[PDB]
Amino acid sequence: EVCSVAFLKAVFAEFLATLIFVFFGLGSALKWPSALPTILQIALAFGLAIGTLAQALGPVSGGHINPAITLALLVGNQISLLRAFFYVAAQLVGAIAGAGILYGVAPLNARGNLAVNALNNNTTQGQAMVVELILTFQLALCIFASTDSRRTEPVGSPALSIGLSVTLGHLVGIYFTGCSMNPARSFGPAVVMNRFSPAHWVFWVGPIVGAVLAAILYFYLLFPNSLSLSERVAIIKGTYEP
Amino acid sequence: KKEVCSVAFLKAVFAEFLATLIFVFFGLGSALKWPSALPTILQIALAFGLAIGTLAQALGPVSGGHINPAITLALLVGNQISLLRAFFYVAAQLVGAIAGAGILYGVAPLNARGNLAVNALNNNTTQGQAMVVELILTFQLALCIFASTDSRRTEPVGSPALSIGLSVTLGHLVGIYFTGCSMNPARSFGPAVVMNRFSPAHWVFWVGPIVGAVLAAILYFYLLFPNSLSLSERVAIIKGTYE
Amino acid sequence: KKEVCSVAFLKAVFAEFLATLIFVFFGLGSALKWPSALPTILQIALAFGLAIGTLAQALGPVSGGHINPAITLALLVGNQISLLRAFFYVAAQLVGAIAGAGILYGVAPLNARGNLAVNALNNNTTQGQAMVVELILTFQLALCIFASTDSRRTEPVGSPALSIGLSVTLGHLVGIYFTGCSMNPARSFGPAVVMNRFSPAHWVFWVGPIVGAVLAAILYFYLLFPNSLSLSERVAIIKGTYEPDEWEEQREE
Amino acid sequence: VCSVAFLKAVFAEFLATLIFVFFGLGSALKWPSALPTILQIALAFGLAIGTLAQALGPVSGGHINPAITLALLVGNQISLLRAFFYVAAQLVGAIAGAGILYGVAPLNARGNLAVNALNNNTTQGQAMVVELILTFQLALCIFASTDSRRTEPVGSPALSIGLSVTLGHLVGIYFTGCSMNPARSFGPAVVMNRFSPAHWVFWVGPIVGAVLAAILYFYLLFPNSLSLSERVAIIKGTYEPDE
């Protein structure tokens, strides 16, 4: 699995995409002096960044760009444990790259905090944890319905469908935590500007738990695969034919 | 007599509960009176509609994806579903819709609470003038739901869930300006359950959607594109004993 | 003669009445001068284009779904419909537009009703200018509608209604700063009759869209993607008889 | 070149780039009635590509962008002469679209005919790197959407490509007014006759970014598997596979 050429491209796509998703998301959501971006303006910019990069590099990788989605798929028994590590690693590296790039290009009067995930003052950690859970649970459940081959119903454009599920997440999430759902999107500018949150665990735990719940529902409860124990073991190592 | 014993039904009812819940949370949540930056009309419209259009793509394959008692009844009135299904489905939708606003209650900050974005009248416009519009909104929506769930279509549908989502966004682009846009009893009931009794124009948000949805269910499923079946099988549907 | 008296054609023009009722109801309804919060340019444009795009999906299989006498009278010149199909459609679109505009006045209160989202020129844009815009605003819309609904298309069309619907929106994002964006003569003639006001340049709102749509047909149908049919076949279409058909139903095998 | 299909294709590149530059620039004028918002301008520019793809895409390929034309020629999808006359058509079409706007636009809203303006806090070097990333991502979507080898559900190539221009504009506006299109930069620059010393960025930025995406797509990521004779034949303009 790991030594093949398809595995090299697939992981590169996750790095490359997460770079651009983070560059465009953060770049669009800076406190620009020309005109401070609106809540819709931001929410579409992320959900067009996910919807565009799904269409481009979803053939190459799978189009995760998201540790939570990757980990949800892993817990759902959709991917190998080796993949999960490299994908997640590529995403986390890519996010730092994209954040890093933005640091260079943007003028100071815009830059500020590089659009890090700021928790709202009236909002708490335990409150913001349940939001990032939901925000990512619907995105996870949207993805898995949109890219299950067993579906007979008309999917249409799962690129711009999954894309818009991000824009849905941002029009609520901007208020509670500045929106995250992607642990890499949080971890990117936190490393570049070199400043973590006290509630940075929320941006990991919330989405990673939120996404895994969707996977537990969709892949075991609602739409089971019906495979033997030894069939499932070979999938996680990376030796499934079928 | 029967369609309940199957686990496919058990999943289908829960999927409505689960779906209806999230639509409310995101609809209301996007609609809350945010002091950080109050939501524009276009914003609230998109967030409401993209909630439906995503949930259709997610749980439409599991439950049909009504996410609304108006469509649940207008599918019973159009002869698309049995009695015992629409009994449990609206039972799921309302139960779900309560939990969804109640979680927004359980998380939202007190400065942004505002109203919990509940449906409330315009002072310049009467209860009659508002009852007229809730027909129009759910009519065109149900017409578009029924048209895009019709398997007979040879025309290129392309994207069902996004076109249904953009119908709900079209619904709010004008329907916010009157009552806050119901197009949905569970969306207007669920949050208003956090109080006690009925408000002044509460009947408007039940009759308006259910009537509107049924007029498309007459026009589409009886007049425009009928079915041509016997009363032996039309009764077998309503019981739920059809193959 | 038989084409008209069939039960298929009853629903085929009734849907144009019901569509243009709902289009000019929703479209104009988002563009009122509201007190609560004045609708933005992007908020208007989307509501018009999504009205088109939501109706074209729902009542596309019924009538085809023009919801526009500029579009219908371009199909007649492009040789896609009969002369009695084009006549009865245009009537129901203008009757629908006035029927919708009538229902809109009946709910919108004193304060908000205002001028009922009627079209009007920009103060620095003359009649010599404003017609050239409304041509191009609708030329592009026709070209999208033709290429999206043409069954000769090999490429993946996607969703045809939304693709078309968001060409109306795109028309509004420029059109409002010149006219309030008509692109549809019925959407001008819908409110103008109800509130009982016509301008010194209402000739721009009729001729501009229809001419733009018809000049797209000359390009698309005759230059870009030609037909290859005889003069007898062209006259057969205009009068309203053409074969072969598909799935005529009935027996026997 | 002498063929009838080439005429229509080159004419459609003129006509589309003309209609693109009209709709692109006109939505972002100094409108005294109501100044255009940022999301509005992104959606205007974006949907012009997402509509002219649907219409004139079948005719020409739906380039409307000398950077995308040159990227494909490097990636090995067209002949030398096809690109030459495509670029010429786009650049002329752009000037026509702008020179058309000179007549119809009023004086009070006019502005500078909406030419790309480099944010004066940002340098030449930085603007180039954004314009690269704006156009690299645009082209990298295009090639995947328009790839006939695609097994995945394609969606509407037209719409997903138009929104990559929207996405492009959501960030690019703050740096340059967003170009990603040497003709859209050149077009209004000839009508008003206003060339900055920083005009080279609008050519070099998108072109370099588009070339990288093509090289990455067609050679590295998704290989072709064809001989040099077939590749030279594509550059010279002589090819016909299957029936």
Author numbering:
A (entry chain C): 4 to 245
B (entry chain A): 2 to 244
C (entry chain D): 2 to 254
D (entry chain B): 5 to 247
Can I see the authors' text?
However, this region does not interact with any other residues within the tetramer. Instead, it forms crystal contacts with symmetry-related AQP5 molecules in the crystal packing, explaining why this region is ordered in this particular monomer of the full-length structure. Similarly to wild-type AQP5, this lipid was modelled as phosphatidyl serine.
There are two consensus PKA sites in AQP5: Ser 156 in cytoplasmic loop D and Thr 259 in the carboxy-terminus; the latter corresponds to Ser 256 in AQP2. Based on the crystal structure of human AQP5 it was hypothesized that phosphorylation of Ser 156 could cause structural changes in loop D that would break its interaction with the carboxy-terminus, thereby flagging the protein for translocation to the plasma membrane.
